[PDB]
Design a binder for this molecule. Structure first.
Ligand SMILES: O=C(O)c1ccnc(C(=O)O)c1
Ligand SMILES: [Zn+2]
Ligand SMILES: [Zn+2]
Length: 216
């Protein structure tokens, strides 16, 4: 339910907020261990040939959990609803990803479902995304926002990260960022990616949250 913790304001363009210690270590491990045997390489069906091929855009492995999948996930899902102030009926289920060994997600918008996403196709417009880091990544793996106002600088950031505002994955933290402005218009500043993971293993769980109930 209701969560009490440190929020770091990252940006107004796009609106981005870092929720410190949003998940416990135990919850992070639970999701990773539940997801692990289910992970498959990110793939899309190539239109021309009509064949399944590895995505060149999201090169992680991936899976999904249904909203309300089980009790432990359900609890987190209610917490996500509380901090975003948007009811559960508008939330997709968890998208779990694992990147390592150079794997990335090229910058894109979360405005709509993408064929690369594991799980069902949900029509509808996302307003907000929550990205929950399930592991701490030693090198690379930053979530980068290239159209943000203030780029990150200095040693300790991957070259990819220095192309925008960037967030280092730290176990238990969650990045909340808005794809739409408060008036429902698109925010082009919400372009975001996952910089290649260079050392370690990046596990993340994404919650995509719509302006209106999913389906139903
Ligand atoms: O894992 C990430 O950092 C990331 C970056 C951009 N997009 C997503 C997503 O799942 O939408 C996840
Ligand atoms: Zn995204
Ligand atoms: Zn690995």
């Amino acid at each position: 339910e209701e969560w009490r913790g440190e929020v770091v304001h990252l940006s107004w363009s796009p609106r981005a907020f870092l929720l410190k210690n949003f998940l416990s270590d135990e919850e992070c491990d639970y999701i990773v261990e539940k997801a692990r045997p289910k992970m498959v390489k990110s793939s899309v069906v190539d239109n021309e040939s009509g064949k399944s091929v590895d995505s060149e855009i999201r090169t992680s492995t991936g899976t999904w959990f249904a909203k309300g999948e089980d009790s432990v996930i359900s609890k987190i899902e209610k917490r996500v609803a509380q901090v975003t102030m948007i009811p559960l009926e508008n939330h997709e289920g968890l998208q779990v990803l694992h990147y390592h060994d150079g794997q990335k997600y090229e910058p894109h918008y979360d405005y709509f479902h993408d064929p690369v996403n594991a799980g069902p196709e949900h029509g509808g417009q996302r307003v907000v995304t929550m990205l929950m880091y399930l592991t701490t990544v030693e090198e690379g793996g930053e979530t980068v926002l290239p159209n943000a106002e203030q780029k990150v600088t200095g040693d300790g950031w991957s070259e990819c990260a220095k192309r925008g505002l960037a967030v280092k994955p730290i176990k238990g933290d969650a990045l909340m960022f808005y794809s739409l402005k408060p008036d429902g218009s698109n925010d082009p500043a919400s372009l975001h990616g996952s910089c290649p993971t260079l050392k370690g293993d990046k596990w993340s769980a994404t919650k995509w949250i719509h302006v209106a109930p999913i389906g139903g």
